Amino acid sequence: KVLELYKPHEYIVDLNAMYKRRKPKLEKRFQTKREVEIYKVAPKAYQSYPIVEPFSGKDVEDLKSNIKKFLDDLMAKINEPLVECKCCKGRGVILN
Amino acid sequence: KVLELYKPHEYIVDLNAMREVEIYKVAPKAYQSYPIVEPFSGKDVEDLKSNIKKFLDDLMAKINEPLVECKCCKGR
Amino acid sequence: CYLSQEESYKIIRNHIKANINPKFARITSDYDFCLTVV
Amino acid sequence: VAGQDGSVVQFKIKRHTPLSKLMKAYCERQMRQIRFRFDGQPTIDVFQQQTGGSKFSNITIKNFRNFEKVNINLDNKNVIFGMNDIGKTNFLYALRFLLDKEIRKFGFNKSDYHKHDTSKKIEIILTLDLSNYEKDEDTKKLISVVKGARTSANADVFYIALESKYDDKELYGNIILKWGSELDNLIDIPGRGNINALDNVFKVIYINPLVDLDKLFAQNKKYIFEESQGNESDEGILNNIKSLTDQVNQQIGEMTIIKGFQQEITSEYRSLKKEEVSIELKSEMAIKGFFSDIIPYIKKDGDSNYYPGDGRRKMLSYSIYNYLAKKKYEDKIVIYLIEEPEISLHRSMQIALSKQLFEQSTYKYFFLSTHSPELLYEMDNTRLIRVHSTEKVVCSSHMYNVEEAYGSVKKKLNKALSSALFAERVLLIEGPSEKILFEKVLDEVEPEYELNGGFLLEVGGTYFNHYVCTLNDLGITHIIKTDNDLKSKKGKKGVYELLGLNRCLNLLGRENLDEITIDIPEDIKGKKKKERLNERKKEIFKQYKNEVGEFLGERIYLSEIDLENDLYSAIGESMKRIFENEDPVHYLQKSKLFNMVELVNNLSTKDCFDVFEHEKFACLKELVGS
Amino acid sequence: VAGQDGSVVQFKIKRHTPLSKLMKAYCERQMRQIRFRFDGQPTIDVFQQQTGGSKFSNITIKNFRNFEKVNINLDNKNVIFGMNDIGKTNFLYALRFLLDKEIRKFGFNKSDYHKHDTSKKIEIILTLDLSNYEKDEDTKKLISVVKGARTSANADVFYIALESKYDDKELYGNIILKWGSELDNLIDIPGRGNINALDNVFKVIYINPLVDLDKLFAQNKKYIFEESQGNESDEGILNNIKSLTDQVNQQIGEMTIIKGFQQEITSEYRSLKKEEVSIELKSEMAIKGFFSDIIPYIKKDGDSNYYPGDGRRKMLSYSIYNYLAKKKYEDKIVIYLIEEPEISLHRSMQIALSKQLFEQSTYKYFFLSTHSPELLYEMDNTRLIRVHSTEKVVCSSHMYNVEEAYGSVKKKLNKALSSALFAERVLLIEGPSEKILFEKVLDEVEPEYELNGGFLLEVGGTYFNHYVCTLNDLGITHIIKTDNDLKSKKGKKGVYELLGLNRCLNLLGRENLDEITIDIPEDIKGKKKKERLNERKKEIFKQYKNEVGEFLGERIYLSEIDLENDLYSAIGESMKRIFENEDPVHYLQKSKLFNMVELVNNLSTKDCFDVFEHEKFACLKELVGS
Amino acid sequence: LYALRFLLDKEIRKFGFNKSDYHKHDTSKKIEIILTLDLSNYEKDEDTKKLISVVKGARTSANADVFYIALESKYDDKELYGNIILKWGSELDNLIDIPGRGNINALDNVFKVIYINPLVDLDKLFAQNKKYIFEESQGNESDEGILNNIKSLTDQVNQQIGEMTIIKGFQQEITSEYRSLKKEEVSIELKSEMAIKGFFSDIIPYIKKDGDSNYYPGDGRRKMLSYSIYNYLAKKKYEDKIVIYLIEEPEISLHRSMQIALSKQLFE
């Protein structure tokens, strides 16, 4: 899920952080887009991905409706936009 | 601070249905980006105890003080 | 309706981490694969 | 003169005559755009200016080890094979000396000169094509480095030359690199210290079959994780891991047995020398960080264990190469020198590697040296270089392509042709019935024909043009044994096309003969129909006797009727006796596969020699090489 | 129950039941002489007392590296192949540890134990057959060394066991060799110092894939000359050479530049140290003798130059092995462990090596580990051991023989079968027309079927018995797609034999059906005759539907009429439009090779999927593995 | 020194004698190496008891004070091999073969030869001995808890590595490349080697200067510390065998001050 911040986020990182012995050197970056994971799925047992479930229907058209409805709400919860709240500088999200 | 949700007995009801905040860092000696702890100084042993005592309370009252209602964006 | 083994473990850890009393109990190992409270 | 697209034109050569007239004649048949080159110096190859072709045109090797003077045409993908193993290895080394900094820095020994004659100078010249400047990004990579070494007149061509003259005083051969658009005058490649301008544009990756996987992951793990960006979550995890490893070292120091040892060994050291030091037992990873010892692990799905399967590790080592090829070097031209990949590789994995090399776009430029036909199962749009068995080191080059007509039979065609490339004499037969008979006859006559270089390649339903053109260009002797066939056009009655004659004519370059009509009565059926067709076949064979004579010169042996009738002429009484039939030829044709096996089983050694020595089966003598 | 000759007998098994009744039943079907063993411990293999069989019966490996518990049958000539490269290498090492003194002297590390579990005991037991004592000289070699370790009751069998238990105190695994006729009690092999009695009888020659020729000639040149007799004339020549080399050294000392250097370098040495010595420059060969540096030179006839090529060095290095094999070890049993000979070997040389291994008698006993089908082109009377792709390391063994019936087609049969051995699923088809269609259909549907282990093996004119028996014994899945065929008997009219049905019945073990008669009018010919036969084929297919049902269980797919008719049942409408002929089936059968190619060219992706999904072409699904 | 190794060291002896090992390359002569031992002070010397226990009946009460360990070798011109046969006994005229099974014999149980060469890598030296040093020591409940705690920490390290986006991205991408190469149900993971094998696999000694936070792998610092490990093992590694040290040219690349320090260790 792609959500943005009004004020760009200021933070400092180390490109020497992967190694311990050498002295750390600081470098600034400015991130305005925050990404949160909302849907992961696998056809089979792979890593920690949840295995997708087979669509079931009492009738072929009933199965079609189940597939159609499931896709609509799943897609809707992804397409609909979310932005942070300035009232709490990013503690919670809100519709823009 | 754990402001994600109010604590008692919600994970169960969510199962039946079917941003991180940094508030205090400290380190005895320089390590990563942790701030250096200040060594307590007191003229008298009882004076020092009172000095560090009041330092613990206001710091930890900040730690244990509850979350903010967050009117606009609330829980989500 | 039988709950999953891993899901069963997760809720206990989440609640134990939630409302234990540091006066009387402490958590030593707090990991996804194991949990010990002393 | 040989065209760029495989066209061949024959011209008369005259002594004390300028080549301008021949150039004008060739241009009129097809001047500033075209360039004429002979053996790598400006058969005569042509350069058709702005065409869709490889950057690499050809390479010339002079006085380098085996190569007295060798000019080899090139392409993006090149496969080198042949019996001369030293020739193949030295060819790859000549490329490394020209383009690889690590090999070049060692200079040339006395042995690196031809016949150890240090008086002669070593020359390795690579010719490049820059005509497709705007279409190709790799051309822009080369042009940017080259800068002013080019000339606007020769903006399409470019040369990279390596020269070396031995220094008898110093016992050293110095390699000097030159480049430029004009071959007569080439300026030295500029450079500072150990590196030169050429090392910035060209990257040579030498893949050897014996490569340790963890060694391969060791060098590249640095780039793979610094190139990618790091967000806030990764930085927090990175710092968290450092804390975890620090705690591991702290917990190690808290053990009684470890604390006891390091205290004792410290006292032992202090007694040895009065120095104010202490000894601590700390984990090496926890000191260097997790990055120092991270390695890939093959994890079977559904299995929790981590495994350090040899074949699994061998194949995945190529996956790292594939992964790096996508994103490691976007600023340089990468040339892969893959030498004998089939070594200790299962044949199923050899086919998998073949698909990667030719079907995929991962390895844009490579030179592949192979001994196994399986690596050529998917070959297409590649240049085949064959090193002849002679010690003189002759190299024959062919640009291999599969036309759109052969696209449906490409898989079957490539599998058969790949084995024929590793042969000296190839006999082209039609089906298994010919193969069954010829294998039996050769077994009794020349049982080790395969050892000497013979090969029985069977082709069916396709013209011989694809096979012959490839074999002829590579210097492999090709013999065609076909039979005179009449094929009936669909939807048209009583009209046949000389399919057997047309295939041989197409090999000669002549046009296909028109279809002829044969009038038969409706009552005439079965054997009567067949013998009527045989009569027409005999008449047609006699009518075109001049063309048949031409075929014999081109090692094309056309049967008057078919193989069975030729076989009957060679051994009539024997075939009639074992077939116990009035007409053995008709019986043999009823079930070709089973009856030929029965005939072959009952054949004697004398009959096999009769077939071998017969005039009709002269192809067998040609295949054997007698 | 598995017989020694390949015959298999099935017996029902109960629970809590002695094996004596089963042994008695088998003896009655075919008791003291026969011996029953299961997985190398006394399907169960049998013993056929005194035969001409190999001395080597089987080998058992327990807890050694990969091999948790593996029993492999053996023969004089053994070929081991498979995807599991580690399993193949470790199998050869297990033989070296048992029989090679040099490998055995190093003991077992912790890694040599299965799963690194040192608590388990490594066991490597080799079972030998001594029944043919009077006719085999190598048996006499073994029993002469063994002496009293045998028993008269078990005079036919013998065991050589390797045992090792790890010593956690010493971090060492000691190898203890035992032998004897009774497996329950084996005595330690007697020995003094480093050698034991077993090292006197067994000689293991490990032919590594890459060897230095001059290295190989260096050690053996000592024996080669001393063993031969030296007459007086040779003695005079030997003394004359010594005089010549002495004169060479004397002449070197007479040179001014040599005398000048050695005089002053003596002064330099004397100034360094007041020692009364002199420094002389002598040729090393003239001091050691001509024998010290004598080496073979490959001299091409008609050329006076002497040369140290490379492939010829590999080939000639084998002839040294050939020469030594004839006349070096006449007093011991020589076992050759040839590992991956095809490495850097031309395919023509691989066939030459194949002929040496199997056709010749040079290598009586050997274990060959190979990845190349070319080394199996001449395979015969050999034991094939296949290591399965699974990590568990299963080994399937088959004793490969070619019958006298197949002797005439042995060369063609072996070439086709050798590639199929390196496959998981093999589909047996008749000719190239089936191959052309299936290759096109698979290319559109499952293009990488060859990568996954699929293989299209074409067999024609022969029964499937030879191919299936080999593939089934090796654990390779075999699928057969044949067609119901009627073959007319020679010399008889109107009578046909169910050749298509008989081949499938022969696979099931059933006897061939009798020939049937067909009455047709003389006027009925051509198309009318063909459709009449097709009607009978349909009737026969319906009549034997029970047998056809049995075939489907054994992955045998018999066409009702032929492949063309099955093809019409799937894409008939598509066949009609592309052919534009009235009868697509009849037209396709007129010229099978050319018409199939034309049809395959015009086939679309949808038609290929229609053929793949059709019920008649279920063999394609089986070959793919879906 | 080699003659001593051939007699007492199993590793050197197992290779046999070449043609060059014979005097003047004359293989007709028999190589003979005899070591004479004294067992008179049996009642006081514990190492004498170690030898007597292994020897068992090879001794004679008449010659209970003297013992011989002999090595004989006659070249086999047929096999181009010189077999080493070890004999022992109290009487020199007749010595019985040293009993043994497989590769080891009774002599290898009593005698341990430690060959110290000047070029010895310290981390190499610590590699084999670290196994013994920690298994022999007694492990209490508190140490057992620390073992389990460390194993949890290393497991969390591997788990945290998999949570990195750049690590997750790569192993997902290369898994697809491997799957494209061949259709095998296989996943690729990037795990720390130490965390898989445990902290014990890669633990090494770090020479830390006093008052210094840094950890350092000086060369002479290592050479001296390598000897102290030999000293530490000498105290407690082999209490059941006679240990003979073959120290060859210790002064190579050793400062003269360290040479005197080594001299004090050897003699004082």
Numbering used by the authors:
A (entry chain I): 198 to 293
B (entry chain M): 198 to 215, 231 to 288
C (entry chain N): 160 to 197
D (entry chain A), E (entry chain C): -71 to -42, -38 to -27, -10 to 255, 258 to 575
F (entry chain D): 39 to 255, 258 to 308
Show sentences the authors wrote:
Protein interaction analysis showed that Gad1 binds directly to GajAB, and we used cryo-EM to determine a 2.6 Å structure of the GajAB–Gad1 co-complex assembly. The GajAB–Gad1 co-complex structure reveals a mechanism of inhibition in which Gad1 proteins form an oligomeric web that wraps 360° around the host defence complex. Eight copies of phage Gad1 encircle the GajAB assembly, forming a 4:4:8 GajAB–Gad1 complex that is around 775 kDa in size. Gad1 mainly recognizes the GajA nuclease core, forming extensive contacts along the surface of the GajA dimerization domain. Key GajAB–Gad1 contacts include hydrogen-bond interactions from a Gad1 positively charged loop located between β5 and β6 with GajA α2D, and hydrophobic packing interactions between Gad1 Y190 and F192 with GajA α2D. The Gad1 tetrameric interface is formed by hydrogen-bond interactions between the C-terminal ‘shoulder’ domain of each Gad1 monomer and a highly conserved set of three cysteine residues, C282, C284 and C285, which form disulfide interactions at an inter-subunit interface. The N terminus of each Gad1 monomer forms an ‘arm’ domain that extends out from the shoulder and reaches around the GajA nuclease active site to connect to a partnering Gad1 protomer from the opposite side of the complex. Each pair of Gad1 proteins that wrap around and connect at the edge of the GajAB complex are formed by one Gad1 protomer reaching out from the shoulder with an arm domain extended straight down and one Gad1 protomer reaching out with an arm domain bent around 35° to the left. Superposition of the GajAB–Gad1 and GajAB complexes shows that Gad1 binding does not induce a notable conformational change in GajAB, and suggests that Gad1 instead functions through steric hindrance of Gabija anti-phage defence. Notably, the Gad1 arm domain directly occupies this putative DNA-binding surface, supporting a model in which the phage protein directly clashes with the path of target dsDNA.
Gabija is one of the most prevalent anti-phage defence systems, occurring in more than 15% of all sequenced bacterial and archaeal genomes, but the molecular basis of how Gabija defends cells from viral infection remains poorly understood. Bacterial Gabija defence operons encode the proteins GajA and GajB, which together protect cells against diverse phages. Gabija protein A (GajA) is a DNA endonuclease that tetramerizes to form the core of the anti-phage defence complex. Two sets of Gabija protein B (GajB) dimers dock at opposite sides of the complex and create a 4:4 GajA–GajB assembly (hereafter, GajAB) that is essential for phage resistance in vivo.
